[PDB]
PDB file of all heavy atoms in Angstrom:
ATOM      1  N   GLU A   2      17.029  49.578  -5.926  1.00  0.00           N
ATOM      2  CA  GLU A   2      18.307  49.518  -5.185  1.00  0.00           C
ATOM      3  C   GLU A   2      18.343  50.297  -3.856  1.00  0.00           C
ATOM      4  O   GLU A   2      17.475  51.110  -3.537  1.00  0.00           O
ATOM      5  CB  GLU A   2      19.469  50.008  -6.083  1.00  0.00           C
ATOM      6  CG  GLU A   2      19.409  51.479  -6.456  1.00  0.00           C
ATOM      7  CD  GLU A   2      20.616  51.964  -7.246  1.00  0.00           C
ATOM      8  OE1 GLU A   2      21.508  51.158  -7.576  1.00  0.00           O
ATOM      9  OE2 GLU A   2      20.651  53.171  -7.527  1.00  0.00           O
ATOM     10  N   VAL A   3      19.402  50.008  -3.085  1.00  0.00           N
ATOM     11  CA  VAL A   3      19.668  50.663  -1.806  1.00  0.00           C
ATOM     12  C   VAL A   3      21.173  50.600  -1.584  1.00  0.00           C
ATOM     13  O   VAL A   3      21.809  49.573  -1.830  1.00  0.00           O
ATOM     14  CB  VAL A   3      18.880  49.953  -0.660  1.00  0.00           C
ATOM     15  CG1 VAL A   3      19.379  48.531  -0.393  1.00  0.00           C
ATOM     16  CG2 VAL A   3      18.885  50.788   0.603  1.00  0.00           C
ATOM     17  N   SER A   4      21.712  51.711  -1.115  1.00  0.00           N
ATOM     18  CA  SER A   4      23.144  51.824  -0.882  1.00  0.00           C
ATOM     19  C   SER A   4      23.472  51.880   0.626  1.00  0.00           C
ATOM     20  O   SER A   4      23.055  52.766   1.326  1.00  0.00           O
ATOM     21  CB  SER A   4      23.727  53.050  -1.593  1.00  0.00           C
ATOM     22  OG  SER A   4      23.597  52.894  -3.002  1.00  0.00           O
ATOM     23  N   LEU A   5      24.261  50.897   1.060  1.00  0.00           N
ATOM     24  CA  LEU A   5      24.702  50.823   2.463  1.00  0.00           C
ATOM     25  C   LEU A   5      26.133  51.306   2.559  1.00  0.00           C
ATOM     26  O   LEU A   5      27.029  50.663   2.023  1.00  0.00           O
ATOM     27  CB  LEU A   5      24.617  49.390   2.944  1.00  0.00           C
ATOM     28  CG  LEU A   5      25.167  49.116   4.364  1.00  0.00           C
ATOM     29  CD1 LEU A   5      24.347  49.833   5.430  1.00  0.00           C
ATOM     30  CD2 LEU A   5      25.219  47.620   4.614  1.00  0.00           C
ATOM     31  N   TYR A   6      26.337  52.436   3.233  1.00  0.00           N
ATOM     32  CA  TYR A   6      27.684  52.904   3.540  1.00  0.00           C
ATOM     33  C   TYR A   6      28.022  52.369   4.921  1.00  0.00           C
ATOM     34  O   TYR A   6      27.328  52.684   5.884  1.00  0.00           O
ATOM     35  CB  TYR A   6      27.736  54.430   3.594  1.00  0.00           C
ATOM     36  CG  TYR A   6      27.813  55.158   2.247  1.00  0.00           C
ATOM     37  CD1 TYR A   6      27.122  54.697   1.122  1.00  0.00           C
ATOM     38  CD2 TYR A   6      28.522  56.340   2.129  1.00  0.00           C
ATOM     39  CE1 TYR A   6      27.175  55.383  -0.075  1.00  0.00           C
ATOM     40  CE2 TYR A   6      28.571  57.022   0.939  1.00  0.00           C
ATOM     41  CZ  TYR A   6      27.911  56.542  -0.155  1.00  0.00           C
ATOM     42  OH  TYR A   6      27.957  57.239  -1.330  1.00  0.00           O
ATOM     43  N   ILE A  27      15.631  43.829  -4.282  1.00  0.00           N
ATOM     44  CA  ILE A  27      16.307  45.117  -4.194  1.00  0.00           C
ATOM     45  C   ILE A  27      17.809  44.852  -4.232  1.00  0.00           C
ATOM     46  O   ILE A  27      18.320  44.078  -3.420  1.00  0.00           O
ATOM     47  CB  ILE A  27      15.928  45.851  -2.890  1.00  0.00           C
ATOM     48  CG1 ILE A  27      14.420  46.106  -2.805  1.00  0.00           C
ATOM     49  CG2 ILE A  27      16.715  47.158  -2.778  1.00  0.00           C
ATOM     50  CD1 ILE A  27      13.938  46.438  -1.400  1.00  0.00           C
ATOM     51  N   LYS A  28      18.497  45.439  -5.206  1.00  0.00           N
ATOM     52  CA  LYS A  28      19.943  45.351  -5.310  1.00  0.00           C
ATOM     53  C   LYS A  28      20.545  46.153  -4.138  1.00  0.00           C
ATOM     54  O   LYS A  28      20.143  47.288  -3.926  1.00  0.00           O
ATOM     55  CB  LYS A  28      20.406  45.922  -6.662  1.00  0.00           C
ATOM     56  CG  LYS A  28      21.904  46.081  -6.843  1.00  0.00           C
ATOM     57  CD  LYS A  28      22.271  46.654  -8.225  1.00  0.00           C
ATOM     58  CE  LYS A  28      21.728  48.090  -8.440  1.00  0.00           C
ATOM     59  NZ  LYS A  28      22.401  48.859  -9.531  1.00  0.00           N
ATOM     60  N   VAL A  29      21.476  45.540  -3.420  1.00  0.00           N
ATOM     61  CA  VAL A  29      22.170  46.238  -2.350  1.00  0.00           C
ATOM     62  C   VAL A  29      23.572  46.628  -2.830  1.00  0.00           C
ATOM     63  O   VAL A  29      24.324  45.766  -3.245  1.00  0.00           O
ATOM     64  CB  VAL A  29      22.274  45.354  -1.097  1.00  0.00           C
ATOM     65  CG1 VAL A  29      23.018  46.095  -0.005  1.00  0.00           C
ATOM     66  CG2 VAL A  29      20.876  44.975  -0.617  1.00  0.00           C
ATOM     67  N   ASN A  30      23.884  47.918  -2.764  1.00  0.00           N
ATOM     68  CA  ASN A  30      25.221  48.423  -3.045  1.00  0.00           C
ATOM     69  C   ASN A  30      25.950  48.595  -1.734  1.00  0.00           C
ATOM     70  O   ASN A  30      25.552  49.419  -0.917  1.00  0.00           O
ATOM     71  CB  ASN A  30      25.166  49.759  -3.759  1.00  0.00           C
ATOM     72  CG  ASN A  30      24.328  49.704  -5.027  1.00  0.00           C
ATOM     73  OD1 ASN A  30      24.516  48.822  -5.865  1.00  0.00           O
ATOM     74  ND2 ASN A  30      23.370  50.609  -5.145  1.00  0.00           N
ATOM     75  N   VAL A  42      30.141  61.487   3.598  1.00  0.00           N
ATOM     76  CA  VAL A  42      28.715  61.717   3.316  1.00  0.00           C
ATOM     77  C   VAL A  42      28.437  63.212   3.172  1.00  0.00           C
ATOM     78  O   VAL A  42      27.724  63.614   2.265  1.00  0.00           O
ATOM     79  CB  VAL A  42      27.790  61.057   4.378  1.00  0.00           C
ATOM     80  CG1 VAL A  42      26.331  61.397   4.110  1.00  0.00           C
ATOM     81  CG2 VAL A  42      27.993  59.528   4.374  1.00  0.00           C
ATOM     82  N   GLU A  45      29.692  64.528  -0.169  1.00  0.00           N
ATOM     83  CA  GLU A  45      28.901  64.090  -1.299  1.00  0.00           C
ATOM     84  C   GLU A  45      27.615  64.922  -1.405  1.00  0.00           C
ATOM     85  O   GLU A  45      26.963  64.956  -2.440  1.00  0.00           O
ATOM     86  CB  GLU A  45      28.583  62.589  -1.188  1.00  0.00           C
ATOM     87  CG  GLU A  45      29.817  61.723  -1.465  1.00  0.00           C
ATOM     88  CD  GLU A  45      29.567  60.232  -1.346  1.00  0.00           C
ATOM     89  OE1 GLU A  45      28.438  59.838  -0.952  1.00  0.00           O
ATOM     90  OE2 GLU A  45      30.477  59.442  -1.679  1.00  0.00           O
ATOM     91  N   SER A  49      24.249  62.707  -2.439  1.00  0.00           N
ATOM     92  CA  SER A  49      24.975  61.515  -1.967  1.00  0.00           C
ATOM     93  C   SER A  49      24.085  60.295  -2.186  1.00  0.00           C
ATOM     94  O   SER A  49      22.902  60.335  -1.791  1.00  0.00           O
ATOM     95  CB  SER A  49      25.313  61.631  -0.492  1.00  0.00           C
ATOM     96  OG  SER A  49      25.916  60.428  -0.016  1.00  0.00           O
ATOM     97  N   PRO A  50      24.609  59.229  -2.787  1.00  0.00           N
ATOM     98  CA  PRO A  50      23.839  57.990  -2.981  1.00  0.00           C
ATOM     99  C   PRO A  50      23.532  57.226  -1.697  1.00  0.00           C
ATOM    100  O   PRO A  50      22.764  56.279  -1.742  1.00  0.00           O
ATOM    101  CB  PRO A  50      24.771  57.112  -3.823  1.00  0.00           C
ATOM    102  CG  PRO A  50      25.815  57.988  -4.331  1.00  0.00           C
ATOM    103  CD  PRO A  50      25.955  59.122  -3.384  1.00  0.00           C
ATOM    104  N   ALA A  51      24.154  57.600  -0.570  1.00  0.00           N
ATOM    105  CA  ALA A  51      23.970  56.820   0.667  1.00  0.00           C
ATOM    106  C   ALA A  51      22.508  56.760   1.112  1.00  0.00           C
ATOM    107  O   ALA A  51      21.829  57.782   1.191  1.00  0.00           O
ATOM    108  CB  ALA A  51      24.822  57.405   1.779  1.00  0.00           C
ATOM    109  N   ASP A  52      22.075  55.551   1.433  1.00  0.00           N
ATOM    110  CA  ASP A  52      20.741  55.316   1.972  1.00  0.00           C
ATOM    111  C   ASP A  52      20.762  55.006   3.472  1.00  0.00           C
ATOM    112  O   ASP A  52      19.993  55.572   4.242  1.00  0.00           O
ATOM    113  CB  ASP A  52      20.049  54.168   1.218  1.00  0.00           C
ATOM    114  CG  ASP A  52      19.624  54.569  -0.167  1.00  0.00           C
ATOM    115  OD1 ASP A  52      18.946  55.602  -0.269  1.00  0.00           O
ATOM    116  OD2 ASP A  52      19.896  53.887  -1.168  1.00  0.00           O
ATOM    117  N   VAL A  53      21.626  54.067   3.850  1.00  0.00           N
ATOM    118  CA  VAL A  53      21.784  53.632   5.247  1.00  0.00           C
ATOM    119  C   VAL A  53      23.257  53.757   5.613  1.00  0.00           C
ATOM    120  O   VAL A  53      24.129  53.373   4.838  1.00  0.00           O
ATOM    121  CB  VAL A  53      21.320  52.171   5.401  1.00  0.00           C
ATOM    122  CG1 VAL A  53      21.581  51.676   6.822  1.00  0.00           C
ATOM    123  CG2 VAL A  53      19.846  52.045   5.078  1.00  0.00           C
ATOM    124  N   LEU A  54      23.510  54.309   6.795  1.00  0.00           N
ATOM    125  CA  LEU A  54      24.858  54.494   7.354  1.00  0.00           C
ATOM    126  C   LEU A  54      25.006  53.513   8.493  1.00  0.00           C
ATOM    127  O   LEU A  54      24.171  53.484   9.388  1.00  0.00           O
ATOM    128  CB  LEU A  54      24.996  55.907   7.877  1.00  0.00           C
ATOM    129  CG  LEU A  54      24.625  57.023   6.917  1.00  0.00           C
ATOM    130  CD1 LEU A  54      24.937  58.356   7.552  1.00  0.00           C
ATOM    131  CD2 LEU A  54      25.377  56.846   5.618  1.00  0.00           C
ATOM    132  N   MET A  55      26.053  52.710   8.459  1.00  0.00           N
ATOM    133  CA  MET A  55      26.301  51.679   9.483  1.00  0.00           C
ATOM    134  C   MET A  55      27.704  51.863  10.066  1.00  0.00           C
ATOM    135  O   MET A  55      28.679  51.972   9.311  1.00  0.00           O
ATOM    136  CB  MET A  55      26.212  50.294   8.832  1.00  0.00           C
ATOM    137  CG  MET A  55      26.596  49.125   9.724  1.00  0.00           C
ATOM    138  SD  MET A  55      26.499  47.534   8.885  1.00  0.00           S
ATOM    139  CE  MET A  55      24.809  47.291   8.996  1.00  0.00           C
ATOM    140  N   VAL A  70      23.944  64.350   8.767  1.00  0.00           N
ATOM    141  CA  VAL A  70      23.938  63.441   7.622  1.00  0.00           C
ATOM    142  C   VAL A  70      22.963  62.268   7.805  1.00  0.00           C
ATOM    143  O   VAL A  70      23.028  61.314   7.059  1.00  0.00           O
ATOM    144  CB  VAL A  70      25.358  62.923   7.297  1.00  0.00           C
ATOM    145  CG1 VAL A  70      26.292  64.100   6.949  1.00  0.00           C
ATOM    146  CG2 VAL A  70      25.941  62.078   8.422  1.00  0.00           C
ATOM    147  N   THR A  71      22.070  62.417   8.774  1.00  0.00           N
ATOM    148  CA  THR A  71      20.962  61.479   8.981  1.00  0.00           C
ATOM    149  C   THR A  71      19.591  62.163   8.923  1.00  0.00           C
ATOM    150  O   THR A  71      19.497  63.397   8.952  1.00  0.00           O
ATOM    151  CB  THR A  71      21.102  60.773  10.376  1.00  0.00           C
ATOM    152  OG1 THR A  71      20.819  61.688  11.457  1.00  0.00           O
ATOM    153  CG2 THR A  71      22.538  60.279  10.640  1.00  0.00           C
ATOM    154  N   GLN A  72      18.542  61.351   8.825  1.00  0.00           N
ATOM    155  CA  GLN A  72      17.186  61.813   9.020  1.00  0.00           C
ATOM    156  C   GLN A  72      16.393  60.904   9.963  1.00  0.00           C
ATOM    157  O   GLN A  72      16.718  59.710  10.133  1.00  0.00           O
ATOM    158  CB  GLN A  72      16.436  61.925   7.669  1.00  0.00           C
ATOM    159  CG  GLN A  72      16.209  60.597   6.985  1.00  0.00           C
ATOM    160  CD  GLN A  72      15.549  60.774   5.624  1.00  0.00           C
ATOM    161  OE1 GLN A  72      16.181  60.526   4.604  1.00  0.00           O
ATOM    162  NE2 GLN A  72      14.303  61.194   5.622  1.00  0.00           N
ATOM    163  N   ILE A  74      13.237  58.736  11.269  1.00  0.00           N
ATOM    164  CA  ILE A  74      12.254  57.842  10.688  1.00  0.00           C
ATOM    165  C   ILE A  74      11.312  57.355  11.748  1.00  0.00           C
ATOM    166  O   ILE A  74      11.597  57.406  12.958  1.00  0.00           O
ATOM    167  CB  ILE A  74      12.889  56.628   9.928  1.00  0.00           C
ATOM    168  CG1 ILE A  74      13.629  55.715  10.901  1.00  0.00           C
ATOM    169  CG2 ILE A  74      13.817  57.117   8.793  1.00  0.00           C
ATOM    170  CD1 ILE A  74      13.939  54.367  10.316  1.00  0.00           C
ATOM    171  N   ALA A 234      21.659  54.284  10.808  1.00  0.00           N
ATOM    172  CA  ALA A 234      20.740  55.400  10.636  1.00  0.00           C
ATOM    173  C   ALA A 234      20.458  55.545   9.146  1.00  0.00           C
ATOM    174  O   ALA A 234      21.272  55.132   8.325  1.00  0.00           O
ATOM    175  CB  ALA A 234      21.351  56.664  11.167  1.00  0.00           C
ATOM    176  N   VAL A 235      19.296  56.108   8.823  1.00  0.00           N
ATOM    177  CA  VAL A 235      19.003  56.456   7.430  1.00  0.00           C
ATOM    178  C   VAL A 235      19.692  57.792   7.107  1.00  0.00           C
ATOM    179  O   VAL A 235      19.635  58.733   7.888  1.00  0.00           O
ATOM    180  CB  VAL A 235      17.503  56.542   7.207  1.00  0.00           C
ATOM    181  CG1 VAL A 235      17.192  57.051   5.787  1.00  0.00           C
ATOM    182  CG2 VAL A 235      16.853  55.176   7.425  1.00  0.00           C
ATOM    183  N   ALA A 236      20.359  57.838   5.967  1.00  0.00           N
ATOM    184  CA  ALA A 236      21.069  59.054   5.547  1.00  0.00           C
ATOM    185  C   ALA A 236      20.109  60.200   5.251  1.00  0.00           C
ATOM    186  O   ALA A 236      18.995  59.986   4.750  1.00  0.00           O
ATOM    187  CB  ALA A 236      21.931  58.775   4.353  1.00  0.00           C
ATOM    188  N   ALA A 237      20.565  61.414   5.521  1.00  0.00           N
ATOM    189  CA  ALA A 237      19.746  62.631   5.420  1.00  0.00           C
ATOM    190  C   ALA A 237      19.125  62.820   4.029  1.00  0.00           C
ATOM    191  O   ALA A 237      17.980  63.266   3.908  1.00  0.00           O
ATOM    192  CB  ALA A 237      20.590  63.857   5.769  1.00  0.00           C
ATOM    193  N   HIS A 238      19.877  62.468   2.994  1.00  0.00           N
ATOM    194  CA  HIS A 238      19.428  62.663   1.615  1.00  0.00           C
ATOM    195  C   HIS A 238      19.211  61.354   0.858  1.00  0.00           C
ATOM    196  O   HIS A 238      19.307  61.295  -0.379  1.00  0.00           O
ATOM    197  CB  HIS A 238      20.437  63.592   0.907  1.00  0.00           C
ATOM    198  CG  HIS A 238      20.551  64.923   1.554  1.00  0.00           C
ATOM    199  ND1 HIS A 238      19.534  65.850   1.528  1.00  0.00           N
ATOM    200  CD2 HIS A 238      21.541  65.484   2.297  1.00  0.00           C
ATOM    201  CE1 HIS A 238      19.885  66.929   2.206  1.00  0.00           C
ATOM    202  NE2 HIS A 238      21.099  66.724   2.687  1.00  0.00           N
ATOM    203  N   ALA A 239      18.864  60.288   1.593  1.00  0.00           N
ATOM    204  CA  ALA A 239      18.689  58.968   1.005  1.00  0.00           C
ATOM    205  C   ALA A 239      17.827  59.073  -0.255  1.00  0.00           C
ATOM    206  O   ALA A 239      16.684  59.509  -0.156  1.00  0.00           O
ATOM    207  CB  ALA A 239      18.029  58.038   2.000  1.00  0.00           C
ATOM    208  N   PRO A 240      18.376  58.680  -1.415  1.00  0.00           N
ATOM    209  CA  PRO A 240      17.594  58.677  -2.661  1.00  0.00           C
ATOM    210  C   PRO A 240      16.591  57.534  -2.759  1.00  0.00           C
ATOM    211  O   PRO A 240      15.651  57.627  -3.538  1.00  0.00           O
ATOM    212  CB  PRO A 240      18.675  58.550  -3.735  1.00  0.00           C
ATOM    213  CG  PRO A 240      19.801  57.789  -3.067  1.00  0.00           C
ATOM    214  CD  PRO A 240      19.781  58.341  -1.685  1.00  0.00           C
ATOM    215  N   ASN A 241      16.816  56.456  -2.010  1.00  0.00           N
ATOM    216  CA  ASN A 241      15.904  55.300  -1.987  1.00  0.00           C
ATOM    217  C   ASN A 241      15.387  55.130  -0.554  1.00  0.00           C
ATOM    218  O   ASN A 241      15.664  54.113   0.094  1.00  0.00           O
ATOM    219  CB  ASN A 241      16.613  54.040  -2.439  1.00  0.00           C
ATOM    220  CG  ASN A 241      17.315  54.203  -3.779  1.00  0.00           C
ATOM    221  OD1 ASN A 241      16.662  54.279  -4.822  1.00  0.00           O
ATOM    222  ND2 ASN A 241      18.635  54.278  -3.753  1.00  0.00           N
ATOM    223  N   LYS A 242      14.653  56.122  -0.025  1.00  0.00           N
ATOM    224  CA  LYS A 242      14.288  56.165   1.381  1.00  0.00           C
ATOM    225  C   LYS A 242      13.433  54.973   1.789  1.00  0.00           C
ATOM    226  O   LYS A 242      13.666  54.383   2.833  1.00  0.00           O
ATOM    227  CB  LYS A 242      13.569  57.463   1.799  1.00  0.00           C
ATOM    228  CG  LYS A 242      13.446  57.605   3.341  1.00  0.00           C
ATOM    229  CD  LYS A 242      12.733  58.894   3.764  1.00  0.00           C
ATOM    230  CE  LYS A 242      12.045  58.773   5.121  1.00  0.00           C
ATOM    231  NZ  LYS A 242      12.990  58.684   6.262  1.00  0.00           N
ATOM    232  N   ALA A 243      12.448  54.610   1.005  1.00  0.00           N
ATOM    233  CA  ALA A 243      11.617  53.464   1.323  1.00  0.00           C
ATOM    234  C   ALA A 243      12.460  52.204   1.437  1.00  0.00           C
ATOM    235  O   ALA A 243      12.283  51.407   2.363  1.00  0.00           O
ATOM    236  CB  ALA A 243      10.516  53.279   0.295  1.00  0.00           C
ATOM    237  N   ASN A 244      13.388  51.998   0.532  1.00  0.00           N
ATOM    238  CA  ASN A 244      14.226  50.811   0.570  1.00  0.00           C
ATOM    239  C   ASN A 244      15.219  50.869   1.748  1.00  0.00           C
ATOM    240  O   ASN A 244      15.603  49.829   2.287  1.00  0.00           O
ATOM    241  CB  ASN A 244      15.015  50.635  -0.745  1.00  0.00           C
ATOM    242  CG  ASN A 244      14.120  50.244  -1.913  1.00  0.00           C
ATOM    243  OD1 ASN A 244      12.969  49.828  -1.740  1.00  0.00           O
ATOM    244  ND2 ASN A 244      14.675  50.367  -3.119  1.00  0.00           N
ATOM    245  N   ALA A 245      15.636  52.077   2.111  1.00  0.00           N
ATOM    246  CA  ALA A 245      16.524  52.294   3.246  1.00  0.00           C
ATOM    247  C   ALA A 245      15.842  51.834   4.521  1.00  0.00           C
ATOM    248  O   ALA A 245      16.434  51.146   5.344  1.00  0.00           O
ATOM    249  CB  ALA A 245      16.930  53.758   3.367  1.00  0.00           C
ATOM    250  N   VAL A 246      14.594  52.226   4.701  1.00  0.00           N
ATOM    251  CA  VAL A 246      13.832  51.807   5.871  1.00  0.00           C
ATOM    252  C   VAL A 246      13.611  50.288   5.808  1.00  0.00           C
ATOM    253  O   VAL A 246      13.750  49.620   6.820  1.00  0.00           O
ATOM    254  CB  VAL A 246      12.507  52.589   6.032  1.00  0.00           C
ATOM    255  CG1 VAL A 246      11.678  52.073   7.206  1.00  0.00           C
ATOM    256  CG2 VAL A 246      12.785  54.068   6.217  1.00  0.00           C
ATOM    257  N   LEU A 248      15.582  48.063   4.470  1.00  0.00           N
ATOM    258  CA  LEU A 248      16.846  47.448   4.842  1.00  0.00           C
ATOM    259  C   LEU A 248      17.114  47.545   6.347  1.00  0.00           C
ATOM    260  O   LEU A 248      17.497  46.563   6.964  1.00  0.00           O
ATOM    261  CB  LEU A 248      18.009  48.043   4.050  1.00  0.00           C
ATOM    262  CG  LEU A 248      19.401  47.518   4.398  1.00  0.00           C
ATOM    263  CD1 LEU A 248      19.479  46.030   4.144  1.00  0.00           C
ATOM    264  CD2 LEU A 248      20.425  48.263   3.553  1.00  0.00           C
ATOM    265  N   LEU A 249      16.867  48.696   6.937  1.00  0.00           N
ATOM    266  CA  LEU A 249      17.140  48.858   8.352  1.00  0.00           C
ATOM    267  C   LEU A 249      16.195  47.973   9.170  1.00  0.00           C
ATOM    268  O   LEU A 249      16.587  47.341  10.147  1.00  0.00           O
ATOM    269  CB  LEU A 249      17.053  50.327   8.718  1.00  0.00           C
ATOM    270  CG  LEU A 249      17.400  50.776  10.124  1.00  0.00           C
ATOM    271  CD1 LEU A 249      18.798  50.373  10.447  1.00  0.00           C
ATOM    272  CD2 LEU A 249      17.230  52.289  10.219  1.00  0.00           C
TER     273      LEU A 249
END
Side-chain angles (χ1 to χ4, degrees):
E2 67 176 3
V3 67
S4 295
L5 175 65
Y6 282 35
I27 300 163
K28 172 180 63 161
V29 180
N30 305 309
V42 175
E45 288 179 355
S49 175
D52 288 308
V53 175
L54 308 184
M55 173 181 280
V70 300
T71 72
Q72 66 184 111
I74 66 164
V235 174
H238 300 291
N241 309 287
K242 191 180 154 70
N244 290 344
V246 176
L248 177 60
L249 184 58

